[PDB]
Amino acid sequence: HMNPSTTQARVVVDELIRGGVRDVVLCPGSRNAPLAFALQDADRSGRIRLHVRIDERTAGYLAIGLAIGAGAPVCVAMTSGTAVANLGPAVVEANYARVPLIVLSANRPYELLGTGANQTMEQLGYFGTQVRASISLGLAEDAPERTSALNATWRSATCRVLAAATGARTANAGPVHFDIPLREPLVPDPEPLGAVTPPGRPAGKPWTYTPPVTFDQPLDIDLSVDTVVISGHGAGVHPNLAALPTVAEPTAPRSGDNPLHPLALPLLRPQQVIMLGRPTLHRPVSVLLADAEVPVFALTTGPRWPNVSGNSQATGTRAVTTGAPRPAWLDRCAAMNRHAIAAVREQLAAHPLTTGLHVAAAVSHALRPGDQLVLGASNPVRDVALAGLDTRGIRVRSNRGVAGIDGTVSTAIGAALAYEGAHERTGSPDSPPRTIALIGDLTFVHDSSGLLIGPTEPIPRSLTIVVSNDNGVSSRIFGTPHDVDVGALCRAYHVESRQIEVDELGPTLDQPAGMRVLEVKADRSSLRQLHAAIKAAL
Amino acid sequence: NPSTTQARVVVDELIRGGVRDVVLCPGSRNAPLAFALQDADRSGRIRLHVRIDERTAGYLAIGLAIGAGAPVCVAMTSGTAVANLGPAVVEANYARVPLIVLSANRPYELLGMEQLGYFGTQVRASISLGLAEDAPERTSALNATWRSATCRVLAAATGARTANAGPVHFDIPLRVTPPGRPAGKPWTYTPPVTFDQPLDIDLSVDTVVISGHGAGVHPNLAALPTVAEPTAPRSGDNPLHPLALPLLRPQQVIMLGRPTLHRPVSVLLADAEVPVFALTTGPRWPNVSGNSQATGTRAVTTGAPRPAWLDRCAAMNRHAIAAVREQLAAHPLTTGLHVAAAVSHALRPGDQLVLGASNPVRDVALAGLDTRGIRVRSNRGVAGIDGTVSTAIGAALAYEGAHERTGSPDSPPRTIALIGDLTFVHDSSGLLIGPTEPIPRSLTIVVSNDNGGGIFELLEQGDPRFSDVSSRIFGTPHDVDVGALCRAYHVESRQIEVDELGPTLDQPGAGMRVLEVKADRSSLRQLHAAIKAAL
Amino acid sequence: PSTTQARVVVDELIRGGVRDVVLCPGSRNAPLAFALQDADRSGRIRLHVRIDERTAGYLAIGLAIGAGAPVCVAMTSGTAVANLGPAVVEANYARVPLIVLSANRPQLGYFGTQVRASISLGLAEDAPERTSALNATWRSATCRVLAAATGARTANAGPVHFDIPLTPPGRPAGKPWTYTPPVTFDQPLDIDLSVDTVVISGHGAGVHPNLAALPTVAEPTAPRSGDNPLHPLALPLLRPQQVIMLGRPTLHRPVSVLLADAEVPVFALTTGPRWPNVSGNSQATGTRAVTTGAPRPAWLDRCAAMNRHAIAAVREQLAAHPLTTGLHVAAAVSHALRPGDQLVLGASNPVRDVALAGLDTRGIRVRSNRGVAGIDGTVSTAIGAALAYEGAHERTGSPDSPPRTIALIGDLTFVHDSSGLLIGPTEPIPRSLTIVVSNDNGGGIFELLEQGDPRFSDVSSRIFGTPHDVDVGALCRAYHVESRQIEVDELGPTLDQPGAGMRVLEVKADRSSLRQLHAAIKAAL
Amino acid sequence: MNPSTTQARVVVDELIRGGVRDVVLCPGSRNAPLAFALQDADRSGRIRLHVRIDERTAGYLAIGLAIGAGAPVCVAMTSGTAVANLGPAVVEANYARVPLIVLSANRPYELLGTGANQTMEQLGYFGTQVRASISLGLAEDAPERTSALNATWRSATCRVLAAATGARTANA
Ligand SMILES: Cc1ncc(C[n+]2csc(CCOP(=O)(O)OP(=O)(O)O)c2C)c(N)n1
Ligand SMILES: Cc1ncc(C[n+]2csc(CCOP(=O)(O)OP(=O)(O)O)c2C)c(N)n1
Ligand SMILES: O=C(O)c1cc(O)c2ccccc2c1O
Ligand SMILES: O=C(O)c1cc(O)c2ccccc2c1O
Ligand SMILES: [Cl-]
Ligand SMILES: [Cl-]
Ligand SMILES: [Cl-]
Ligand SMILES: [Mg+2]
Ligand SMILES: [Mg+2]
């Protein structure tokens, strides 16, 4: 015989594994001990990798990283009370970035809500419309005669949680709140007088199998009309559009070989626009989408479609193309793209001081096919886009959902861990692929506690964090530098760090060292002149 | 620009309502009342605090409000502000902290702020002002409407009518200053209500008082044996050690406030043979077991405790105190209980004490802290380990500000925080205060560092049969260099031994310093079992 | 400024397929009511005014399920949100495109859980230097509302809250501002038909040609996929090894017992992203089946034998029973239907008894509020269903009278929504709607439940039966509606007789013998 | 003794001790345990039962029963739109401060989302219009804990009554 809380936790953990969950983030507590015990045992048998963290807020962004690194649903488990509320920021990010994040909260029994019990709040529903679903398991009953029926109901609810999070039937992945009320006894009973977990379906199959869904919405587009493609976060790959001039955000997957620099778009006159994904980065892009005279055709992978344009003529998922672009239009767009690249290149060289744009250019040139790049959503993504990075053959991650500074370090760490984990499944005996992160100093200092990894927890094998330190009424905290020593922060969290120059950045990134932080000074003073010089050069 | 005029009307009425501190974070949107708050800051009518981390900003506001009992405003500015403020707002609801959350929505924008679901369940009120309309003739009527909504917001936050203080959402939408009542009086005067529910209690029945967070002060119960949590204001001279409770058989329990500590208390409160009388200061009342027989706000007492009962309680109290003292001395390694004892013996009348969750708030009550003359703060609302550093900082700032505004030439009184290492790791970023922002002048954070969560060694998951599995999932060692952490944030820090803790606290240092004491948690369970065996 | 914002929104809703709007008088939504009034006088939209806001919601449900079109309801009061609650819940669960229009001059929890979207336009600012950008913003948002309501991109139609807080053209050729092709939601399931399989199809099911040969228990609202029906009462006489469940089945305890059987795998095929699993035995979900094998001939033989046995045991035990019951009235209405008719069923016994009588749904359109299975709103639902259905036949222009809409409801249901018969003289009235009322003076379904056991005979009269003694005939005449008390035998001929646009036919029925009649049918199987 | 019946009999008894003299009942299958326990209390003269068919009109009947003499009044109904029909009466009871206890039966909460018949998001439907939204635990079959389940059930009933009558908030 097994106590009810232990049985329920072992069933849930088993069904989550069968649904593709490979990594679980756990935060310590007493009320979530049943989940903790069952997760620890699955990690001892090698069925999942467990990542323990102390701060639930940054642990939520770690889980986002573990999910975007390879595309698998990731659970984060914590105790009752403000621990659940600390997942707020990650849940908002995962909502707008469509990240399959399962928030697995332990709770007191609902009967205690309103009694004044310790560490108990209104947990179910806390996340509102940010989550794709708020699902509660029932309090586990002590009914050995009903063991088979309770197993079917727990595994079915778990599959609903997994389906809603991965978007298996909605094509709209996102975060899910899975709340589990738990009561004493919370620790497993003596194992000699123990029992076996109620089994699932045979052959490691999910309890409710849901096969791959196809969400199809064709759209007719005449490509002979002068067309530009603008691809943002969450865009899909469209091979029938690969020839068109394309302004692509760094995180957007590239369809073709005809890039168009974002600075070139204002100097051209497209007659119609194809919007892929959710573009938000570039401001001239936003200017063109506000232009009411230019028809916009939106192509999304899911049912959500962006509000970035008011003259959206149609929304679909793929294009049924008629015609071909004027060769003179392709020539003009290619000509302007080269002009914009040269203008950026020349003005960086003419600039004396090293700026953040220089570091971004230096990181972009040091990337090799197969690398993963993680970018802070402030200046790093804009700077890499102005530098003209070729994203083909590399995977680029960034928290573009709400583009916050919270959790950027933890996201890079998680993405590096999932990326390296997927490289072992291929059975290859090579070295793990590189993960390079480029983040600002203010972002790094704000999520420096994301560097904290207990001595027994997984550490990324090939992660390098490049910190572009530019030392910068509510804006009066930027009137002075924050003055924090990046080296001191790294020592506090036992992390190797080096201060280097932009010339050294390339050759130092090629040195094969676990996790490390590479700090590069830059100047914010001259940035306004450099950007003004680039615009005058066009 | 009427929107600018509106902001000065609200800020002025907020200052008339008792607001002395506002917390801001930079964000995409202009802050609600940002420039009116800036004008008020330079003129000395209000004090601004700016932070980058919105989570630590919320908990700083909680500290500013519990340090002296004043309402405090927090100014949201971004699309992450609601999610990051959630923890502080939840804690303000359960600890009854007057917290005003200022927001600035756009009614000309299309909808359908990144709102979650907690605003509905956590706040006392949700008041919007309405768009500032241009009308030079209705300026005296608009002034009255804006100042009435502001007085209503402060009343809901402080519980002026409900006796249930808590957080309030105040929205001021955006697309000289008109005057208020004379002598700086608020627009709408509401006397702080008196909430009265007298209850009959016979004190001849063997009775114990158990007072928790939010407990009132009761002079007619002063003689009874009393198990008081650290945050409860004391009203008697007859304290009863929490470890003495299971050595007695009370026939009656008076519960003051909301108790959350000591499983011996929970066992006694759940015993259906022992009537429990709940005396609370607000409308809510605790009933975790279902054994709360009656509720009230004050006791109408008949009789007095039997002299033999008081003698029995005092004898068991002396056995409990001796067991804790003798077993602490006979134990080689320093634990958090040793650290808590040293801090307790170092406090002086007038000190403010801030206690983190986990073992520190329990250990101080096991050491027998005398709380009279002392101000004790702790986030017992939801017992989170998040935001405790910023709560201490805010509590010190508000506490020092009240002493400064009495004009006493003496140095500001001390605020001493006692927190675990995970608690410090959780909110270490709360230490980053820009040179422009107010910094405490007498805040000392004592960090009892046992490299993980020591309380789990004392629970069921700390039983030796889990010794192979409980290190990763409960102990959670981190190996953080605390001194290196405080250096990066430019905060004075010193690692010392428990016997040096007393003298180091007695002398002053920088306005803000962190004292770290290395402690052991591998002997923690053995030390507590030996204390129980010596009772 | 707000006057042109209302006119553009109304124009885009009409371009989006809205043909009917329900409005309740009140001191609000004045500009939108004007724009709607203008379009009603222009012939672009049909306006329906009601006084009861709860009946107005269920009327809009009917106008939507009658021809599958989006329908709007305009709130104008500080009680409308509470009164539209029941209809919004029904629209959520039955996936009905209901657009609820508000106009907050600057609060229950159901809006957060029940609706597909909550969109507010924003205030109508006064800047004629940007009137072409406000035009697109208003027609884009309105296209989002229409798309969320009809499931254009989600394949999950439902209610939408559209708030316009208190004339420039659209696309040429009357097209919607943002075109969205109806989406294809596909998810194939591998099913082996050589296993002994029964199909159980409920509310919201699709049509599956590769399943037309399998024995099929179909709820009346389910569109039949083939021509091998299996009577529900035959199910406990069979031992299927596999169940294909279409849509959302909600009727028949044998069906419920079978789906709960953990030995029998269940394969759920749904037209949308939601799927049922009350038991936890759902082995897989999908939208269509990829089939191998073929059903065993012995299995088909057994099923067809139980089917005829169940049909015969019902048709004969109805003859022996002398008293007229609700099961007889359902049988009578079922044989009085011809292809092209629309049949509206109330919940409780009427929708179950029609299934026991063996109605052949082919050629008939069957409506019923199975989403939450409420006895409220059925009268106004049938009126709206008739109006929408007759409006579609009128737009084709056939040289034939409007097709018939027959409603079969219980007594309690008729008095629960009696105020749905209060239709003002200026208001559109059905032209071929006949409401048949089976009246056994109480709730006859409770006689078939555990509280209907003879050991609760002296306690179950008050709390389950609830006689009302209401004179149905007088209630209809008070509302200026034709009524006639007929017997079960004259039901058919009276129904065949073309009559007034609205007729209520009352048939007396017995419920004291209902538990005996269902036990006699059970023993004859 | 089956737990639903014991649970329903404890709640009804404690409601009566709290001053409830009138209860409005609407017919349904899911609220059978409350219906039986209420009928038993009407036969004994402890309360006066009132049966109605329409839940919307039943809520205004309970409001009348409350303002007639100033006592808390209950309205019990089944799951589904039966609760949604109490919407208009709850709104009126909120603004007029009438102690109206909406006593709703429900399918088990684990059935929410499974497509079960007559199951909706009931808990929280009324939102900000109620003084409190309290659920009892699903009655467990466990004779060892009957005394603990009694205290838990009666304490919750008292919280319902105090919030409805404003016993400690002065805001019925
Ligand atoms: C926000 C939050 N997360 C998690 C918990 C669970 N919890 C309770 S005590 C504790 C350990 C705290 O350790 P520390 O601060 O080092 O104190 P110690 O008990 O070792 O003195 C934890 C994680 C909590 N109460 N709040
Ligand atoms: C709004 C609502 N309230 C209550 C119920 C519960 N219920 C189900 S069947 C029924 C009785 C309906 O009786 P009637 O319409 O006369 O039908 P009969 O079963 O006698 O044919 C009731 C009250 C419901 N489904 N909907
Ligand atoms: O007395 C208090 O301070 C207090 C505070 C609270 O937040 C409570 C919450 C639930 C139940 C009782 C509570 C209570 O008695
Ligand atoms: O297929 C349908 O029509 C349908 C409709 C619904 O409203 C559902 C609600 C919950 C669960 C399943 C559902 C479902 O399968
Ligand atoms: Cl335990
Ligand atoms: Cl950054
Ligand atoms: Cl604690
Ligand atoms: Mg510790
Ligand atoms: Mg009837």
UniProtKB/Swiss-Prot annotation, chain C:
Pathway(s) annotated for this protein in UniProt: Quinol/quinone metabolism; 1,4-dihydroxy-2-naphthoate biosynthesis; 1,4-dihydroxy-2-naphthoate from chorismate: step 2/7; Quinol/quinone metabolism; menaquinone biosynthesis
PANTHER family: 2-SUCCINYL-5-ENOLPYRUVYL-6-HYDROXY-3-CYCLOHEXENE-1-CARBOXYLATE SYNTHASE, PROTEIN PHYLLO, CHLOROPLASTIC
Single Gene Ontology MF annotation: thiamine pyrophosphate binding
One record GO biological process: menaquinone biosynthetic process
Cofactor section: Mg(2+); Mn(2+); thiamine diphosphate
Enzyme class, broadest EC rank: transferase
Keyword Cell inner membrane part of the UniProt annotation: no
Similarity comment: Belongs to the TPP enzyme family. MenD subfamily.
Entry annotated with the keyword Manganese: yes
Gene: menD
Job description of the protein: Catalyzes the thiamine diphosphate-dependent decarboxylation of 2-oxoglutarate and the subsequent addition of the resulting succinic semialdehyde-thiamine pyrophosphate anion to isochorismate to yield 2-succinyl-5-enolpyruvyl-6-hydroxy-3-cyclohexene-1-carboxylate (SEPHCHC).
Subunit record text: Homodimer.
Name of the protein: 2-succinyl-5-enolpyruvyl-6-hydroxy-3-cyclohexene-1-carboxylate synthase
A single Gene Ontology CC term: plasma membrane
EC number of this enzyme: 2.2.1.9
Record's catalysed reaction(s): isochorismate + 2-oxoglutarate + H(+) = 5-enolpyruvoyl-6-hydroxy-2-succinyl-cyclohex-3-ene-1-carboxylate + CO2
Note: Was identified as a high-confidence drug target.
Cofactor: how bound: Binds 1 thiamine pyrophosphate per subunit.
NCBIfam families per UniProt: menD
Sorted UniProt keywords: Magnesium, Manganese, Menaquinone biosynthesis, Metal-binding, Thiamine pyrophosphate, Transferase
Pfam families registered for this protein in UniProt: TPP_enzyme_N (PF02776)
